[PDB]
Paper text:
Most extensively studied in this group are the F-specific filamentous phages (Ffs) that include viruses f1, fd and M13. Ffs are also strikingly simple—their single-stranded DNA genome encodes just 11 proteins, of which 5 form the phage capsid. pVIII is the major capsid protein that forms the filamentous body of the phage. The tips of the filament are formed of the minor capsid proteins which occur in pairs. pIII and pVI form the leading end of the infecting phage, which interacts with the host receptors to initiate entry, whereas pVII and pIX form the trailing end11,12.
pVII and pIX are small hydrophobic proteins of only 33 and 32 amino acids, respectively. They both lack a signal sequence, form a single α-helix, and are present at the tip in 5 copies each. 5 copies of pVII form a helical bundle, packed together using mainly hydrophobic interactions. The terminus of the round end of the phage is comprised of the N-terminus of pVII, which is mostly negatively charged. In our map, density is missing for five residues as the far N-terminus of pVII, which would contribute to the negative charge and be of mixed hydrophobicity. In layer 1, 10 helices of alternating pIX and pVIII line the outside of the pVII bundle. Interactions are mainly hydrophobic, with salt bridges between pIX and pVII subunits, and hydrogen bonds between pIX and pVIII subunits, adding further stability to the tip structure. Further copies of the main capsid protein pVIII continue to coat the round tip in two further layers (layers 2–3), interacting with the pIX helices by mostly hydrophobic interactions. The helical symmetry of the filament is slightly altered as it comes close to the round tip, presumably because of the slightly altered binding partners, and the change from helical symmetry of the filament to only 5-fold symmetry at the very tip. At the round end, the 5 C-terminal arginine residues of pVII (Arg 33) and 5 arginine residues from pIX (Arg 26) form a positively charged ring that butts up to the tip of the DNA, where the packaging hairpin is expected to be found.
Residue numbers in the entry:
A (entry chain GGG), E (entry chain HHH), H (entry chain III), K (entry chain JJJ), P (entry chain FFF): 1 to 32
B (entry chain BBB), O (entry chain AAA): 6 to 33
C (entry chain QQQ), D (entry chain MMM), F (entry chain RRR), G (entry chain NNN), I (entry chain SSS), J (entry chain OOO), ...: 5 to 50
Write the structure that this text describes.
């Protein structure tokens, strides 16, 4: 089940990296 | 050769699940 | 897990960012309210 | 079935990920709504 | 038709898990 | 169905959440209207 | 045709899912619009 | 061209079923 | 066409829904304007 | 070419679908903008 | 490179047909 | 290019649509401003 | 490499498409912002 | 941290702008109150 | 022939990752 | 790993070309 | 990298665009504030 | 494993891309928030 494990791991990596930026933009807009 | 096709599949798969991850992440 | 390490870094960044946002809001709101009260009290006193 | 097995394995991984996501959301939304209420009440009191 | 059944089941699982969070955020924003 | 169980849990969570939201709104609106009326009646009486 | 058969099976599964989705939407939207009207009428009456 | 015909038919089915809900939500929000 | 039947059902639902929306708007707006005019004329008469 | 043939067949199906979509949009948008203008003019006249 | 040419052509066809409607809705909302 | 023809039709439609939008805006804004000035001058003259 | 060749061909097609997109955007955005400013200045002058 | 630097720069820019705003408000309010007192004292003296 | 299939895979892959890129880019 | 390298390169090309337009629209709206 | 060149062009365009936006905002805001002050001071002087 | 190797290579490429994205975001958001504050403080001071 190696394929599944490492393809799912690749989805979660992309979700984390981008959402980082989603939080920056949001926190900034509201604060100002 | 079967093995060439096999390797290709894995490689494309990894990239396609990254891109869908990125799209999921920018949803407000 | 390959992804466990990734999640921890996100957690850390978010904590710090919440910290910075609170600092900015205080300064902006301070100014806004300050100006509002100035305008109000000056006119009532006159 | 090979496909039943596949779905069963997916369910486990998905459950963990949903767990992490709930943790993040709580912290961010806490801050967002906190700042919103601060701005609101400050202005009404002034 | 096993493949179809279990792949569709996998779409509906992802729709449910995420929309849970969509409802939290919404109900919160409005209430406050 | 593999998905039937999943849907039931969503239903349950949504019911509870609607409950919490009604509680919060009451408290916030109470305060807002309270302050508004205070400002109004104090000025008319003076 | 193998593909006609495929589409026919899909239609059945999709019909059930659309049924569940309609149930969820009703409950959530009920609450959303309820809170909106509460906020509106309270403020106009005050 | 059976594959094409029945795969396109499957896209249009999903577009119709969901947009139904998009219209409900919209008409409701505006009316209220 | 497999999809032709589907489109017709959408058309029908949309027609009915537009009907319901017009009914709701009339009632809400009636109330809003009613209250507004009450407040206005009462104060001018006094 | 097998692929030229594929694209040619797709174009026909897509043209029909775009036709149905234009019909739906007209009806929904008619209603939306209608309600918007009603709300606007009623309030200005009052 | 026939496959690439005709698959890209198929992306650009879908982009054009939909964006047509995006412009209608926008221009309408603003004008009114 | 298979897509060149498609792009030209989009260009044409957009030009016409911009034309229609300018016509609508003029009529709505005419009314809005008209009513505003009526209310203003009537009250100053009285 | 077969894949290097693939990417090279893609780049050419993408460059043309980006060219068409820039042309469309200019016209639409021109109109949008035009109407926005019209509405704004008309109201301030009145 | 790329984000820490960003927040720091924003806060600095906002502090300068609050400085300029205070300068403008003083001049406008000076004039307003000046004219008010002129009108008042001239009439009481005469 | 295996090679025909191989080439096809690569070609489709490149286009599909472009389209997902475009979608990611228009997210506000 | 040629396939991976050149497919990822193709994602980043599409992200850059479009976001260009996202920035135009944004900067314009705010400025006006 | 195939993509390195692409990123550099984006950087350059963004710098120039920020430049243009600052120019537009100054002109619009100049007008807005100008009209506001005109209306204010004319009425106080009268 | 061929798939472990695949994921490892992906991680490297993704890290570089995230680096470029952070650089862009900083510049754009700087400008956006700058213009927002300018508009706000100018109006309050006037």
């Amino acid at each position: 089940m190696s394929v599944l494990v490492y393809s799912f791991a690749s989805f979660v990596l992309g979700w984390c990296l981008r959402s980082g930026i989603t939080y920056f933009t949001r926190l900034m807009e509201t604060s100002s | 050769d079967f093995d060439t096709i096999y390797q290709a599949m894995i490689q494309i798969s990894v990239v396609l699940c990254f891109a869908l991850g990125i799209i999921a992440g920018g949803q407000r | 897990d390959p992804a466990k390490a990734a999640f921890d870094s996100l957690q850390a960044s978010a904590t710090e960012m919440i910290g910075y946002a609170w600092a900015m809001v205080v300064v902006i709101v301070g100014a806004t309210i300050g100006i509002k009260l100035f305008k109000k009290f000056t006119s009532k006193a006159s």
